[PDB]
Symmetry: C3
Subunit: 59 residues, 3 copies
């Protein structure tokens, strides 16, 4: 009569065919770090190489 | 007895430990623009530099 | 009185304003391949170019 079961495991999931499924499997796991976190990293090493960018300009 | 509250705020959220939580916090916000939208941008400037790619080939 | 309808289509969706909405539209579709799958690809061609990296070092 009622569909909810109230599943509590601290885990996150979506509504699919009347089933609770970890969205992470469709997000692509990696903590999701591999989508977001790399972009943040690139700037950091790339930015320290600017000392060479103005070097040409100033001299 | 019943778990649903019917929360309406135009916002989107997932089922976690019996709580409605904004999936955006796990998507990584930025509108999500910073995952998708950059990829689309790279092509654009990179593509305008093709005039130099055939230049070598043709001459 | 009750909000659930039990929609079964094998498709996945989130809870928004009391409506079932395909999270894919907010994920950015592409199978999501275009967020995850490219990163995996870059390594592959980039890694085959290492034969040139040690070449300088060894000679």
């Amino acid at each position: 009569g009622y569909i909810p079961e109230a599943p509590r495991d601290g885990q996150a999931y979506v509504r699919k065919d009347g089933e609770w499924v970890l969205l992470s499997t469709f997000l692509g796991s990696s903590g999701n770090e591999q989508e977001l976190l790399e972009l943040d990293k690139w700037a950091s090493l790339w930015n320290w190489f600017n000392i060479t960018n103005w070097l040409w300009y100033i001299k």
